[PDB]
Structure 1
Amino acid sequence: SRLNRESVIDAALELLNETGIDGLTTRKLAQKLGIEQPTLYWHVKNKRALLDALAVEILARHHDYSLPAAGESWQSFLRNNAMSFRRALLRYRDGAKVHLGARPDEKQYDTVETQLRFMTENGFSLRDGLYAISAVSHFTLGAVLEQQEHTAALTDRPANLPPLLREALQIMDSDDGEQAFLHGLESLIRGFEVQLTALLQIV
């Protein structure tokens, strides 16, 4: 079929959902596209190049809150940005693992620069704004990775529990992690605000 970049991404994403990240291979991608492996090689040099591209295109296509709305507070931005990033990560099987393979790509530079500048325009130093943005990113990624690895590990093998842990798993599995994620997100934001408003005061 067609092997323009967009079409190759479409197929690779379709394949990722079928196989997961570990099981995705350029050989399987060539099969899905109806082509020979050396043909695919002209377009996609190896799995790593493919994964790097997926990490970018997943956010380009499905992360709709990269940028603040006009007039938006930094708090509200971090909240909306996190919710969007989580959704985009969860959209594809092993999505968090796909993301983590790389740091910002050149096509992402303008976006992430704008985010860093936005925090500095709202009273943060570059360093403290980077600390906040990174903390949100890492908390979000960790939460998704946990969900997605539990989905995986369930396919290899199943799972005398003590009472609070029993209850905690029952609670942690009453939704897809969303309550825990949102509650932690608010805690994080509030801690950043306390820190910011403190200025040079001992806090």
Structure 2
Amino acid sequence: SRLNRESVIDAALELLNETGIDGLTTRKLAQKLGIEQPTLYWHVKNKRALLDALAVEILARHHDYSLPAAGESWQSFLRNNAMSFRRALLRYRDGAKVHLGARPDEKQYDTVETQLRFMTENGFSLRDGLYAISAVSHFTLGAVLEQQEHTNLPPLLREALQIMDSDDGEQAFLHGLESLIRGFEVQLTALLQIV
């Protein structure tokens, strides 16, 4: 098949949905592409190189709300941004593990920079804006990994689980997301006051 970057990644993602991350190997990627292992190696040095690239391509391809709209609030941008991240991470099997393992890369540097600047433009110190972004990010990754990694008992526990299972974990994600955004707001608002 074609072994340009885009084609190698198409096939690696397609494989990831077949095998998950633990089973994704270069050997199996080579078979999928109908090529010998040493041909693939010209293109893809190892699995870590492969994963590094998938993590970025997944976000470039499906993470539509990297940047805020003109006039958008930081409440609404962190909302939309976190929702876009969750969806892009769920679109591929072990998506959040492929994300976790990778390097916030040169090509996304300007995305994350814009975000840190955006947050500083609406009244966050750098410090408190990076904490806001890292918490959203850590909350969203953790919920998505649980959703993905789950792939007689006491009553509350029985009912709680039954309820978590009702939907994908989206209601529990969006609820905690609102708590997190408001917590940030209550902090930002108070300034030097004891809160």
TM-score (norm 2): 0.99
Which residue, 153, 162, 167 being the options, matches 2:159? 167
- Give the Cα separation in 2 of the matches to 1:185 and 1:116: 19
Q: Identity rate of aligned residues, in percent?
A: 99
8 Å contact from structure 2 (residues 82, 140) kept in 1 = yes
Structure 1 residue 160: Cα displacement? 1.8
Q: Is the partner of 2:3 in helix, strand or coil?
A: coil
Deviations 1:70-108 (A, max 9, x none): 000000000000000000000000000000012310111
8 Å contact from structure 2 (residues 44, 50) kept in 1 = yes
Q: Is the partner of 1:173 in helix, strand or coil?
A: helix
RMSD between aligned alpha carbons? 1.0
Structure 1 residue 201: Cα displacement? 0.1
Deviations 1:94-138 (A, max 9, x none): 000000012310111110100000000000011100000000000
Which piece of structure 1 moves more, 99-108 or 127-136? 99-108
Deviations 1:154-178 (A, max 9, x none): xxxxx92000000011000000000
- Give the Cα separation in 2 of the matches to 1:4 and 1:137: 32
**Within-5 A mapping of 1:1-203:** 1-150=1-150, 160-203=152-195
- Unmatched tracts of structure 1, length 5 or more: 151-158
Deviations 1:164-193 (A, max 9, x none): 000011000000000000000000000000
Structure 1 residue 63: Cα displacement? 0.2
- Give the Cα separation in 2 of the matches to 1:120 and 1:43: 41
Which piece of structure 1 moves more, 26-35 or 101-110? 101-110
- Give the Cα separation in 1 of the matches to 2:104 and 2:149: 24
- Give the Cα separation in 1 of the matches to 2:142 and 2:161: 17
The list of structure 1 runs, each at least 4 consecutive aligned residues, that deviate by more than 6 angstroms after superposition, is none
TM-score (norm 1): 0.95
8 Å contact from structure 2 (residues 52, 103) kept in 1 = no
